[PDB]
Structure formats: structure tokens, C-alpha cells
From a paper:
Metabolism of 2-aminoisobutyric acid (AIB) in Rhodococcus wratislaviensis proceeds via the initial, selective hydroxylation of the pro-(R) methyl group by the monooxygenase AibH1H2 to furnish α-methyl-d-serine (d-MeSer). Previously, recombinant expression of AibH1H2 in Escherichia coli enabled its structural characterization and revealed distinct mono- and dinuclear metal binding sites housed within the AibH1 and AibH2 protein subunits, respectively.
Collectively, these results indicated that the incorporation of two manganese ions and one iron ion afforded the most active form of AibH1H2. The unique locations of metal ions were determined by analysis of the anomalous X-ray dispersion collected at either the Mn K-edge or an anomalous isomorphous difference map stemming from diffraction data collected above and below the Fe K-edge. In contrast, the dinuclear sites in AibH2 appear in two distinct metalated forms. View 1 of AibH2 contains a dimanganese site with a fully occupied Site 1 metal and a partially occupied (∼60%) Site 2 metal. Since this latter view represents the only location of observable Fe content throughout the structure, we hypothesize that the bimetallic arrangement of View 2 represents the correctly metalated form of AibH1H2 that participates in substrate hydroxylation. In this scenario, Site 1 is the expected and observed position for FeII binding, as the coordination environments of Sites 1 and 2 contain five and three amino-acid-derived ligands, respectively.
Author numbering:
A (entry chain B): 11 to 375
B (entry chain A): 29 to 378
C (entry chain D): 5 to 374
D (entry chain C): 28 to 378
The structure:
């Protein structure tokens, strides 16, 4: 029986992207799904056979130094051990597998054939546990599930959610309905029953354009634009009363940035002062939900012009609910040694690196 | 001396029948024959708490801001304000039939001109444009460019395509040619879900979240090249908050540095472009009115030139038009906000 | 309905006909006895927000006179708001013995389907109030009329609860959905509603709608009214393909669905193309138990109005039979402007036996009239 | 001079984006290599599915059909029946969001067709691929190729970002008419909304059958918005989108036009007529019109024998083959119109 995670001298890394080597998922995939992939690929919300609608720019958006002798960055578990876990003393490294093969962002849960999507989520969860987590329990799994077919996702959370190698449920930042919709409540119910928090990672797809007012053109628009989905999701999860129904549910927004949440929440409260009549069932003031329910990981770290502004904004969001991440092996990887500005308080940096993630994932020393 | 300009107040169309004097017989007769469906938007639901504060004068139906006499009486009563920029948000941009969109937009601008501008020389207005035909929107701008009481172009925060798309360059061209700033005002054409993750379930959720679309718009406007192709461009963000701007600006700056060769015409940092070309109205203030927060947000913006005073009359917000004074200790900053920053937009003296 | 609750007798079609689409509307305030106080207050303060940016109208408002026949206006209210006028101008005039009410409008200031309200708790309350209203005001006073009960397809929990609440009432003959949805209708999302309908032995009618969450075509919003009105058939085409190819009728082998006011003739070349494509590409859906067009006879019905008008009238009967001659059901769409009269609807050379079963036996089979 | 037998829809398959390098400026060629050359191969005919290529097709070193002119010409012209073939390359440049890159790769793709296909066999013609996310750039791409008469039509996808009748898209129709080129709509799309009005089809099979719904939308948009009065020499070819759906659409649209004509007063001819006179359709797939009597029936329901034009849709595999359409008719006159006369209206190609 795998031991519980332990963070002592090291740090929490809430976002790591491993990749299965070619064929690594086949031992866990039913035969009916293999043939389907060979013929159809993993069809999703594009008209494209092999790539997503916004393919990465320079060098697949990966660190130039993170490529194994063969295979794609994140596909060599030795290189991940030495180049990431050993090199930064990561003692809880949370895996978020965004692709079933050598791609950078093509989520299993977003396959339009949702039976295929559940199968691929299943294989991914079996693979990451045998290949990565059990051989090196410094890593633990955020398990992808099919958020757009809650029956399948509840089944998967029941199948593997209690495994001590699993520390969270993994969803995507973009969805067909905003995440406070009742559609997803069975998933929140099943997660709470397994004592699992939920991580929503940056994604493309989802069923709508990547902004609420058209598809973006240039890279600066696409990448900056990822923040917007998370703003919309926070507003729905809070205002829908989801945390009234599920008062122990914890959710983390992963790689949506952090600082922008603070003015968003401030605007939310301010508007709610006038317009709260529309939502009379909501039991608390909107900003009061953040502390017990809404977490955010740090990468890619906000870089204000005046460095001081970072700690201020992180505290105005919630300093207890900010969790460190590297995003290894992506190109905008954050190094825990160098991500924080010089004047940053040590208390805040220490709990971002340890306590904050420990409490989110239910970890003790 | 630069005038105190209320940079966003509203005229409310009584009903589509108010357009009949300004429509050709084909559209006037048709209007009547369709039973006059109203395109009154739901951006400020008439029966909700934001629609009008309790001190605003009302008409026989209990509605504020449906006549220039009522608006002028309220806005200028205390003598502080010298001019007011009128925005009529009647939903012509949600008329799908493109010719009717053009006709009603023109008629609405005629209604503003004849029943508002002609009645008080302290009023100015934005030009409402049929945004679904950018070529026609350009022609609408040209048509009103000879009346200098129209001081800006009205665009909704949610569009059909992003405003930086080449399809929309005729609007920016026409605005620059008329020497007019372009304002984005909360509201939308609603031709997709208002967020990238689907349809907000309440007006409150929608209203708060439209700031995300303004990030999309500004990134599209700048990355696509509007500020280099049309370098005299001026953008006013009306009634969309502003505290969200610094975290957007910093990320945009950081990725512009990662992605320089993708957009080579952008040779200045988006930080400086936004500080130089973008202005923002102060109603709602979204918590910047609290102690010290107005100095703080100006520090975070890195410029004291961006914020321009508005009341957003007749709307009700949690703090009032002059409550922003509690957020700063600087009379010089308040002078920028009340007078000097808007001079860059309209060049209006007292 | 899989156990009936109530003493009202089941419908009897002997010498009259079936009308599968009738639009009543509540008089102003007629729903308020059935609405919680919280929703009356909500509506007064916010209206019924849906997938538009408009306070009072839908995104494609009606053109000529609200698209009602100019002779169906009462003393006071909207067409379809007078129960006596509807009884004399429609039920008596055309000897309709089973008229199915398709209420998609709560009424007064708001004409969008209750189910499409973005506040789904408000949507569920409007659907429920509608069903209480139409059963007390129309069906039980004149049981020639029966209710297709609107439910919230986009929140299946609430729809299941409504179907369990009144779905066994003999005044109810169908579940009423819309033609536009956020996901195609074969999606697993809607399966709990199909399950609840089956448990009550209720068929489902999907009526022409705007809204849904997407543009009104799969390739942009329409401009002119010819594009809008003709474009309605596209949603039905997409819904038929989804419901069949999804295997929804494998899971629910007794489920009956009718597409209401989506025309009929276009379904036949659509189904034909579906089979042809499936001959090559069937391997993508290996669990689909039947050839796609075999699901039609057991599962897919369509109403007549507005009647297809081919240039050569002989083509109507051909295409109706190519769709399925047993599954085409008559409708008037009283009181809309393109209202079809059973005396004049069909073209002079139409086969009489096909015509008779469209007016009688086909609807009786759909609605379980025996 | 006798009108030629024209195969009105065959496909060239781009091997990889690396095939575009010899036709890109150094900025775009260097960019593409630095990006690791992501492929915009579409999913319209998934390369492993039964539709992608018939069993009797010549294949390259990787098993793929129609990636070289030599393979296509060997197959398409083997039996001597076909005189010319119109090549459509569906490589997904229209799904490139970055509008500069859409322009560059569309241009490079047309160069690839010109140099490695049209230059290689004088029986081939081709459509012009355009960057349809910038209609004004799309018009300039039509113009760029307007002097090369081996390009015979303009390629648009069935599902666009905005309906093709919207004024935003008028530069495309105007440039096509000015160049004397028909516009073809081919199955496929930019996927910038759900492919249907009710959301995302969950399988390729559902998607493929249902794109006919979008062609009704496009035709109603094109005609209602006035394209056929404003650009009265316009010709539209529907390529690989079926055609049996056309009559019931035509009838409804005619019926409603009789009521709504004052809403679109420039449309003084019935749509029925406008469609018969301006729209043509390729015959692969035949969607069951190849069954006995069914081709005579659909021509009767269309009310015109001028709309169907022959195609094989090479290399794609359909339930019936390119000339099985003969089983659906008893008229040699109709078959002569479908095989050669109808296409003469589009291309004016003689034997
Ligand atoms: Fe990441
Ligand atoms: Mg309360
Ligand atoms: Mg015939
Ligand atoms: Mn990343
Ligand atoms: Mn305002
Ligand atoms: Mn009806
Ligand atoms: Mn009707
Ligand atoms: Mn083809």
C-alpha cells in the first residue's frame, strides 16, 4: 500500500506534464478503441486530424533542453527524475497528463466520442500510476475524467479515485457549460465522496470560441487569452452556489495566472452589492467563497513592472490559496529558485512552496 | 482650461416608435406592421437595481433618462459638470437583417441629434454604428463626421468578430479619418456565448464577466496592428471597470516579448501602447473608491493619464460618481481624472 | 401513462382527426396562481433572460403581424389566448378530437420557450406553471385537447422531476422539447429524460424553436427572413442524425419522437444520404444495432404543417412515403399565419388512404390512442 | 469542338507541410521548421477510415493515395474515359487562425498545385485555395491566379466563419466573377462554431452526413443577400455535398419567398429558378440516386437536367462508384449532360 505523500525539506509542484511514449497506453486500452484511433484519430472540436486549433509556436512550446535522446519532452521518466524532481527537490509533483501521445495539449476528456474519451482517460490513469507514480511516489496523479459525460467521470472517480497515488481530479479550463452548471455537480459529488479536490488546467477546445467575442488571431492573443476562461469559470462556480451545495469542495485553477483573480473578485463583490437581488439563494458574499474553495497555481508567474505589486495582488486574491507549479517541461517553466521577486516576503513564498499546496491536496508531514 | 466632461451618460429610447420620424416610409410603415418589436437590450434590465438610481428623475412610465430635459436636469444640477457624452444602447446591433440594422442605426443617431444634441449644447454623443456591416459602419461614421457634437464611435464590448480582424478595419479607418475616438461599452451582439466557456446563467454573472471580452478586444486591436496602421487611434473603455487592466497588461507584455516575430509591426511594448492609446471611465469603480485604492490602481497601471471621469447616469452602482475621491490623497490625480485626461479625447474647454 | 393517475378518460378518435400542433397562450397573469412568490418577483425585476441580449424579444422577432392569421385575434388578448374562440374557430370547425397543445410561451411580455430561460430554476418553475395552467384551463374543461408538457431539457434533473409529477395524468399525451439544444439530442445528457418519458409511456415532441445556445445554422447567423424561416429545417436534420446515429433508440427501444413544424419531405433524402454514407463508414459506430433508416418506422414521426409544396404535386406523396407513410401526422399550427386547413392542405391528387391515416391512424399510433 | 468529359472533383493530398517549403518566403519557411511543422491535414476524410481511399488506388511509400500527380493521373485517366480532372486540395489552411500565415500557406499551396500538379499533366485543372478568414486577402489570391487559366474555380469550404452572403464576404464573389471563375463549396469547414445549429456532432459519420444542412444555409444566404443580382454571372458548384436534399429545400424556400419577397425585393425571380440556373452539383457521392430510376426521379424533382455534373471524388471510396449513376436513369441524353454538357457551362473545356 503506497504511503501518503510527505513534504518536509522539499516543495510542491502542482503542474507537471508527462507524456506516454509511443504505444504506452495500448496495454490499458480495449481493442475496440485502438482500431478506432488508427482510423479516426482522436476527433475533437476541430476540423483537423492531428493538431489542435492553436498549435504551438517555437519548438512545440517545450524547453529546448528537455528533449530525451528519443521521444517528446516529458516522455522519459529518468530525465523527468533528474531534470525536475531531483533538481528542485520536489516531494509532491502533481501529474497532469494533457495528451495521450507525443502532443503538447490534446486532452483525452475532449474527444467528441465520449466513450473513446472515457477509455483514454482510463488508460491514462492506469498508465501514469504504474509507469510514474508507483515507481517514484514523489509524483502523484491528477486523474483526467470526462467532464462533459458526468456518468463516465463518476465511474472513473469510483474506480481509481481512492488510490493513494491519486491526489486530485483533472478537468479542463474550457467546457460547453460554465462549471457552476448543475451538469457537473455529480462530478463534484463523487470527488467529495473520495476526498479529492479538483484541478482545472488551461485547455483549448470546450465547444466555444477561445474568447467570448471571437476566435483569436495571433499568439499573443491566444496565450494571454487563456486567463479569460478561468475568469468566467470562477464567476460561475461562485455565483451558482456550487459551494453552497458542496461546502467541502476545493478547486484549483491551474495555469490561468493568479493576479488577475484579485480585481475580478473585487469587481464581483462590488457589482453584487447592487445586483445581489438576482441571486437570493446564494448564502455568502461572493468573495467569502475564495478562502475555502478557490486555489490557483503560480506558473507562469505574474511579472508586474514594479515587482512589489506581486505579493500585494497575491494577498488580495488569497495568500493561503496560491500554490507553486513549474509547468515542466513547457517553455515558460518556472524555477522555484528564481520565480519570485527579490523583495517577496519569505512567509508567503514558503507557504506557496509548501503549506498552501499541502492543505489543498490534504497532505501532512 | 479643459472642461469637466462626464465621459459616459445614457439616453434611453422610449420605444421603437421614437424612430418613426427618422425612418424612410419603407422602414416606418414596416415598423408599425411588425407591431414594433423593441430592441431594448438586457444589459441593464429595466426593473433591476442597476437600471436607475432612486434620485433620478423619471417619466410617466417610471423610467429615467428617456428625455434630454430629465437627463440635463439631473446631471448638471450641482454645477460640477461642464459636458456629458451621451451613449444610447438601444440594441440596433442585435438586428440581424443588415438593411434594417443600417436603417435603425441611422434613425437612432438622428433621434440623438434632434432630440438631445439640439436641445442642450452641453451634450455630446457617440455614433451608433451597424456593426454587422463594417463597410456600412464606416459610412455611418463618415455621415456624422461633419457634426462635431458627435465626439466618438460607439462599439459594443462583445462583437461578432474581434475588432482587430481585418474585416473590422473599415471602422477604425473611418474613426481615425474623422478624428474620433472609439469607445467599447458593456453590451454585446450575443452572436456566440458571452464567455469562452458558455452562456452565463444570470445578468449578474454576465455583467461582471464582460471584462474578459475587453481583454480579448484590446489584445486583438493591438496584436492585429490597429495602432500602427491607424496611429491616431484613441480607445475609450466605457463602463467596463479598470482594475483588471494591470494584470492583463503585464501578461500581454511578457508574451509580446516571447512572441515578437509573430507580430513584428508591434515594436513598442503593449504596456506603453495601452497607456498611450487607451482611456477608461471611472463608473463603476469596482472598489477603487476605497481608501488608498485609487492611488494603488494608478500605480499598478503605471500611468495617471488613463482614467476619465464618468457618472454612468442614470445607472446605480455601489459607489457614486464622486466617491473616487476617497481612494486618493492627490489633488493632481483628481484633476487628471476630472478634466485633463478627457481633453486628450474631446478637446473640450470651459 | 405506465400507471395512470386520474379519472379523466383516454382520448378517442373515431370520426374526427388529430391535430398534433396547437399553440395556446396564457392570458396575462394566468400563470401567477402557479408560481412561487420568488419567481413573480424575479420576473418583474429581470424578465426572462435567455440566449439573447434583448429584454423583451427573441433574436428573430416575427415579421407580419407577429406571424398570426389576422382573423384569430380575440377581443382583448393575443391569438390563442381565448379558450372559446379556439374551441369554435378550430376544434368544432375541423372536428378535432385529439388536439395536442404545444405551449412554448409563458405569455405577456415574454414569448420565448420556458425551457430556454438561462436561469434554469426559473425555467423549471415556468414549465411547471404552464403545465398546471394548461391542464386546468384547457384540457380538463375540454378534453378534446391534451397537453404536451414542456420540461427543461437542458437540466434533466428538473425535467425528470416534472415528468414524474404530472406525466401519468391522462390529460398529458407527450413531453415537449425544442428543436434547438446545446448538445445534439442523441447526447447522453438527455437520456435521463428519455428514460423518464419511457417509464410513463409518453412520446416526445420537439417543436421548432430559436435559441439553443448556437447560431441558427451550423455556419453562421441568418440575415433575412427567408433564411431564418427556411433555416428551421436544418436543426431538425441535425437532431434526426444525432438521435439515430447515437444509438439512442438502441438504449430506448420503445421511445417515440416527433419533429413538430420541421417539415417532412426533406427527411427522406436526408435519411437516404445517411444510409448511403453509413454503408461505407459504419465501422465508426460498431455498436449501432440497426441500419440507420430502420429506426425511422419505430421511432421518428413528423407533423405536416407547414405542408411541403413541390412544383409537381405528385412528389409530395412520394417523399412522404420515402420518409415513412405511417409516421406523418396532421397538424394545423393554430393560430399561426401558415396555418394548414385539413380540407385544403393536401393537393388535389393526393392518395386518399395516405391522407386518411395522416389525419387519423398515424397520430393515434404516435400518441398511444387505441 | 465537343464538350469534354470533366471529372469535376478529384483530390490532391499534401504529403506534409514540408512540401510547402519550396514555395514559402524565408520568414515563413524558417518559421514552419522552427514550429516543428504542425500539419493542418483535415479530418474531413480521416486518413485511416473507409472513405479516405479506395482499395484500387495507387499509393506512395507511406501507403497514402493521391499525394503525387503521377499516382493520381495513373489512376484517374487509366480507362480513357475522362478528358480533364479538376483538382481540389483540402489541406486545412482555412483553419489557420493566424491570418498572415493563412495567406502565406494558401499561396504556397496553390504554388504546389501549379508546379507539381498542373505543370505535370495538361489534363489537370485546379481550384484556387483562398484564405477565407480575410475576404479581401481571399480576393487578392483569386486575382493572383486569375491569369493562369488552369485554375478554373475558387475553393470555399461548406462551413465558413460567416455565411457567404454576408456583405463581409462580397469581395470573394466579386473577384470570382471578375476572373470568370465559378465558386465551389466543398464539404469541410473552418469549425469556428458548432458544425450544426444544435451543437457538435459526436462522430465523423454524423458530421459528414449533416453538412448538407449548412449548404442550405449558404445557398439561402447567397441568394437572399442578393449575390445573384449583384454578381449576375456567378456560378456555384457544390462539390461532394450530395444533392438529393436540394428539391425539398428549393420548394420551402420558394414557398416562403412568395410571402417574404418585400423583405428581399431584389429577388424578383423565384429561388427555384435561380438555383436551377446558377447552381451545379457533382455526382460523387450519389446518395442513392444511382439506384434504379432514382436519377430520373431526382432530376424531375430538381426541375432541371442542367445541374448534375460528373465527378469521381478520387481517391475517396463511396458506396457506389463514379459511373454507377447510369443505373439510375434510362436516358442517354441525361447521361450526356451529366458526363460532359453540364460542365461545359462551368469550364468551357473541349475534347
Ligand atoms: Fe501546465
Ligand atoms: Mg436569501
Ligand atoms: Mg419523377
Ligand atoms: Mn504550459
Ligand atoms: Mn455606461
Ligand atoms: Mn407549431
Ligand atoms: Mn408556427
Ligand atoms: Mn471531393
Amino acid at each position: 500500500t503506497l504511503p501518503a505523500p510527505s513534504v518536509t525539506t522539499g516543495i510542491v509542484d502542482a503542474d507537471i506534464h508527462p507524456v506516454p511514449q509511443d504505444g504506452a497506453l495500448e496495454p490499458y486500452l480495449d481493442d475496440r478503441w485502438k482500431k478506432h484511433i488508427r482510423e479516426y484519430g482522436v476527433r475533437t472540436t476541430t476540423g483537423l486530424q492531428f493538431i489542435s486549433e492553436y498549435p504551438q509556436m517555437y519548438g512545440g512550446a517545450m524547453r529546448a533542453d528537455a528533449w530525451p535522446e528519443s521521444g517528446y519532452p516529458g516522455s522519459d521518466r529518468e530525465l523527468l527524475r533528474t531534470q525536475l524532481l531531483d533538481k528542485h527537490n520536489i516531494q509532491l509533483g502533481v501529474l497532469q497528463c494533457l495528451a495521450p501521445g507525443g502532443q503538447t495539449l490534446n486532452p483525452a476528456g475532449q474527444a467528441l466520442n465520449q466513450e473513446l474519451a472515457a477509455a483514454l482517460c482510463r488508460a491514462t490513469n492506469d498508465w501514469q500510476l504504474e509507469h510514474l507514480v508507483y515507481p517514484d511516489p514523489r509524483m502523484r496523479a491528477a486523474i483526467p475524467v470526462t467532464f462533459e459525460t458526468p456518468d463516465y467521470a463518476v465511474a472513473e472517480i469510483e474506480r481509481v479515485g481512492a488510490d493513494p497515488g491519486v491526489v486530485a481530479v483533472l478537468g479542463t479550463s474550457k467546457t460547453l457549460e460554465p462549471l457552476g452548471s448543475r451538469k457537473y455537480w455529480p462530478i463534484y459529488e463523487a470527488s467529495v465522496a473520495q476526498n479529492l479536490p479538483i484541478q482545472f488546467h488551461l485547455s483549448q477546445g470546450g465547444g466555444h470560441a477561445n474568447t467570448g467575442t471571437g476566435w483569436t488571431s495571433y499568439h499573443t492573443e491566444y496565450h494571454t487569452g487563456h486567463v479569460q476562461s478561468f475568469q468566467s469559470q470562477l464567476l460561475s462556480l461562485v455565483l451558482s452556489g456550487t459551494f453552497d451545495r458542496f461546502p467541502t469542495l476545493k478547486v484549483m485553477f491551474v495555469e490561468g495566472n493568479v493576479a488577475h483573480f484579485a480585481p475580478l473578485i473585487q469587481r464581483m463583490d462590488y457589482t453584487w452589492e447592487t445586483l445581489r437581488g438576482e441571486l437570493p439563494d446564494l448564502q455568502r458574499k461572493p468573495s467569502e467563497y475564495i478562502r475555502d474553495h478557490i486555489w490557483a497555481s503560480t506558473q507562469p508567474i505574474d511579472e508586474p513592472e514594479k515587482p512589489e505589486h506581486l505579493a500585494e495582488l497575491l494577498e488580495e486574491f488569497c495568500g493561503d490559496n496560491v500554490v507553486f507549479a513549474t509547468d515542466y517541461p513547457h517553455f515558460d517553466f518556472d524555477d522555484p529558485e528564481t520565480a519570485f521577486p527579490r523583495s517577496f516576503p519569505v512567509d508567503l513564498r514558503d507557504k506557496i512552496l509548501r503549506g498552501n499546496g499541502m492543505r489543498f491536496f490534504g497532505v501532512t508531514n | 482650461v479643459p472642461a469637466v466632461v462626464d465621459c459616459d451618460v445614457h439616453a434611453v429610447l422610449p420605444s421603437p416608435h421614437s424612430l418613426i420620424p427618422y425612418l424612410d416610409e419603407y422602414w416606418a410603415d414596416q415598423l408599425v406592421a411588425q407591431l414594433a418589436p423593441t430592441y431594448e437590450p438586457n444589459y441593464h434590465p429595466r426593473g433591476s437595481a442597476i437600471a436607475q438610481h432612486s434620485d433620478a428623475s423619471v417619466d410617466e412610465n417610471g423610467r429615467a433618462a428617456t428625455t434630454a430635459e430629465n437627463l440635463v436636469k439631473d446631471v448638471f444640477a450641482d454645477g460640477f459638470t461642464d459636458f456629458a457624452v451621451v451613449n444610447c444602447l438601444y440594441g440596433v446591433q442585435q438586428i440581424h437583417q443588415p438593411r434594417r440594422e443600417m436603417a435603425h442605426a441611422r434613425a437612432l443617431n438622428h433621434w440623438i441629434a434632434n432630440e438631445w444634441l439640439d436641445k442642450d449644447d452641453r451634450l455630446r454623443a457617440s455614433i451608433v454604428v451597424p456593426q454587422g456591416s463594417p463597410r456600412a459602419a464606416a459610412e455611418e461614421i463618415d455621415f456624422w463626421s461633419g457634426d462635431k457634437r458627435f465626439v466618438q464611435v460607439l462599439l459594443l464590448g462583445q462583437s461578432e468578430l474581434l475588432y482587430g480582424r481585418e474585416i473590422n478595419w473599415p471602422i477604425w479607418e473611418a474613426a481615425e479619418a474623422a478624428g474620433l475616438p472609439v469607445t467599447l461599452h458593456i453590451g454585446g451582439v450575443f452572436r456566440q456565448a458571452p464567455t469562452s466557456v458558455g452562456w452565463p446563467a444570470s445578468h449578474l454573472e454576465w455583467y461582471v464577466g464582460q471584462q474578459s471580452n475587453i481583454e480579448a478586444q484590446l489584445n486583438s486591436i493591438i496584436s492585429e496592428g490597429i495602432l500602427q496602421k491607424f496611429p491616431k487611434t484613441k480607445i475609450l473603455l466605457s463602463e467596463l471597470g479598470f482594475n483588471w487592466l494591470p494584470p492583463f497588461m503585464w501578461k500581454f507584455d511578457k508574451l509580446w516579448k516571447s512572441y515578437r516575430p509573430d507580430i513584428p509591426w508591434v515594436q513598442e511594448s503593449p504596456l506603453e501602447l495601452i497607456r498611450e492609446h487607451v482611456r477608461v471611465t471611472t463608473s463603476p469603480s469596482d472598489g477603487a473608491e476605497e481608501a488608498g485604492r485609487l492611488d494603488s490602481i494608478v500605480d499598478r497601471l503605471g500611468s495617471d493619464r488613463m482614467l476619465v471621469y464618468s457618472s454612468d447616469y442614470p445607472h446605480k452602482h455601489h459607489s457614486g460618481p464622486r466617491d473616487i475621491e476617497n481612494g486618493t490623497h492627490s489633488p493632481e490625480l483628481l484633476d487628471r481624472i476630472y478634466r485633463r485626461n478627457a481633453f486628450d479625447l474631446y478637446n473640450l474647454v470651459v
